[PDB]
C-alpha cells in the first residue's frame, strides 16, 4: 500500500541510483531520498525544505555514529529496526539526538529494565 512504494525507492537506494540527499557521518557518505527523510525526522525536514533542487548534502554532527545511523535509514524505508545487544546504546543515543518520533523509549528500553530487575 504505502508500502510497495517505499519498496521502490529502497531498491533504488540499494543500487545507488536516482538519489537526492547525501548524508555525511564521520566521513562516510550515505545516499538517501528527500521525502523519506522528511517524513522520518523533523531534524531532516527542517534542513531539507529550506534548500532547493538537485544535490543536497547534510552533515550530521559529531556525536552521531556510523554504527547508529547505519540503522534508522533502514528503519525509514523498511519500517523495522535491528536490535543487537552488542550495539543498542548508540542507536538510542542517535534516536534521541535526531528526535525521531516513530520510536518510543519507555515502551522500548523497558526490556532491559525487566531483564535487570
Amino acid at each position: 500500500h504505502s508500502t510497495n512504494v517505499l519498496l521502490s525507492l529502497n531498491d533504488q537506494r540499494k543500487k545507488d541510483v536516482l538519489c537526492d540527499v547525501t548524508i555525511f557521518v564521520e566521513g562516510q557518505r550515505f545516499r538517501a531520498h528527500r521525502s523519506v527523510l522528511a517524513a522520518c525526522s523533523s531534524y531532516f525536514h527542517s534542513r531539507i525544505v529550506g534548500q532547493a533542487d538537485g544535490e543536497l548534502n547534510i552533515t550530521l554532527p559529531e556525536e552521531v555514529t556510523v554504527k547508529g545511523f547505519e540503522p534508522l535509514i533502514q528503519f525509514a524505508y523498511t519500517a523495522k529496526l535491528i536490535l543487537s545487544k552488542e550495539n543498542v546504546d548508540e542507536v538510542c543515543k542517535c534516536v534521541e539526538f535526531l528526535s525521531v518520533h516513530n520510536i518510543e523509549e519507555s515502551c522500548f528500553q523497558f526490556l532491559k529494565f525487566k531483564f535487570l530487575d
Binding site: 504505502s2 517505499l6 536516482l18 521525502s35 523519506v36 522528511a38 527542517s46 552533515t59 518520533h101
Partner: protein
C-alpha cells in the same frame, strides 16, 4: 577563455599537485571551486593564491584537510575578493578570520556553516571592515552570540540575506535587525530565544521581507502568524515547522494576506482538517501547502482536495508517488 572557471569539485583523487600547472599556463582565474576535495593540502592553495591575484569566488565546501593557512594566503594575496564560501571545514579558527576582514574590504558574501571554532571575536573584526556585505550565513556555530548580531547591523547597512540557524543568539540581539532597511530573507531556525514581540516588529519595520524561515521555535504562537499575515506586503515564503500553532494560522495566512506562495505548517502536532481546506479555499495565491507528518490529516481529504485544487501542490508522507514518478525516465526496476 574556456578556463577561468576551474570548478574541480568532486575530483577527490584527480586534484594532486596540479593547481600549479593549471595556474602557470592559465592565469587570471576569477573563480575556483574545490568543494568536496580530498587530495591537495593547504600548500596547494598557498601556491595558487600567489599566482591568482584576481580571485573573486573562492569556494571550498567540506574540505576538512585545509586549515587557517589557506585563508591567511587567500586574503594576503587577493586584495579584491567578493565571495568566501567555506563549509564544514572544522580546523578554521579566529586567527584566520581577522586577516579576511582586515585585508579584503570587498567581500560581499560569506558562509561559515559548521566551523565550531568561530567565536564572535572574529565576527566583530569581519564586521569592522568588509562594509560592502550583502549575504551572511551561519550554521550551528556556537560561541557566536548577540554581540555579533549587534555588530553586523551597525557596520553593514546593505545586508539582504541573514542566516543564524542553530546559533546562540537571544531575542535581545535579534531585535537589532530592524535597522537593516534592505533586509530580504531571514533564516532564524532553532535559536535560544525568539520571543513573540520581536518577530512582529521585524515585519512591521523591514518592508522588504520576502522570506521568513523561523522554524523549530516552539514558543512562537498563532497570533504572531496572523500579525505577519496582515503586515507582510512582500512576503512569499513562510516556513512554520514544529511551531506551536493550532489550525487557525492556516485561515489567518490565507484570509488576511494578499502575497503568499509557500507555507510549510509541518510536523505540528495539532493541525486538524478544515485548515488545509480553508486556506486553499480562501487564499488568493498559494503554490505550496506542504503539510508532512501531520497525523491528524486525512488522505481522502487531501486526495479529494488535491484533485479539486490543481493549482496548489501539497506535501504529505503519501506524496512519495511523485518521487516514484521519476521512474518515467529510466524505469527498468519492476
Amino acid at each position: 577563455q574556456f578556463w577561468k572557471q576551474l570548478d574541480l569539485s568532486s575530483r577527490q583523487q584527480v586534484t594532486d599537485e596540479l593547481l600549479e600547472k593549471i595556474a602557470s599556463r592559465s592565469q587570471n582565474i576569477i573563480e575556483i571551486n574545490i568543494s568536496d576535495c580530498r587530495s591537495m593540502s593547504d600548500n596547494g592553495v598557498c601556491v595558487l593564491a600567489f599566482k591568482c591575484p584576481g580571485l573573486l569566488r573562492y569556494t571550498a565546501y567540506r574540505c576538512k584537510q585545509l586549515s587557517d593557512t589557506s585563508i591567511i594566503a587567500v586574503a594576503s594575496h587577493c586584495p579584491l575578493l567578493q565571495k568566501v564560501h567555506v563549509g564544514n571545514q572544522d580546523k578554521l579558527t579566529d586567527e584566520g578570520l581577522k586577516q579576511l576582514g582586515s585585508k579584503c574590504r570587498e567581500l560581499k558574501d560569506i558562509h561559515f556553516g559548521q566551523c565550531y571554532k568561530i567565536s564572535d571575536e572574529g565576527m566583530i573584526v569581519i564586521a569592522k571592515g568588509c562594509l560592502k556585505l550583502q549575504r551572511i550565513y551561519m550554521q550551528e556555530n556556537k560561541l557566536v552570540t548577540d554581540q555579533s548580531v549587534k555588530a553586523f547591523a551597525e557596520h553593514c547597512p546593505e545586508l539582504q540575506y541573514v542566516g543564524f540557524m542553530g546559533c546562540s543568539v537571544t531575542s535581545k540581539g535579534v531585535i537589532h535587525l530592524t535597522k537593516l532597511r534592505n533586509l530580504s530573507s531571514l533564516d532564524l531556525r532553532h535559536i535560544t530565544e525568539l520571543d513573540n514581540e520581536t518577530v512582529m516588529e521585524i515585519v512591521k519595520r523591514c518592508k522588504n521581507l520576502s522570506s521568513l524561515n523561523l522554524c523549530l521555535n516552539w514558543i512562537i504562537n498563532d497570533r504572531c502568524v496572523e500579525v505577519i499575515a496582515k503586515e507582510g506586503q512582500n512576503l512569499k515564503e513562510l516556513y512554520l515547522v514544529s511551531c506551536k500553532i493550532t489550525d487557525y494560522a492556516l485561515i489567518a495566512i490565507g484570509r488576511y494576506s494578499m502575497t503568499i506562495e509557500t507555507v510549510d505548517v509541518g510536523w505540528c502536532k495539532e493541525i486538524t482538517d478544515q485548515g488545509a481546506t480553508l486556506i486553499a479555499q480562501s487564499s488568493k495565491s498559494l503554490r505550496y501547502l506542504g503539510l508532512m507528518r501531520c497525523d491528524k490529516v486525512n488522505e481522502v481529504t487531501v486526495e479529494q482536495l488535491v484533485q479539486q485544487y490543481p493549482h496548489i501542490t501539497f506535501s504529505t508522507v503519501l506524496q512519495d508517488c511523485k518521487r516514484t514518478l521519476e521512474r518515467a525516465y529510466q524505469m527498468g526496476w519492476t
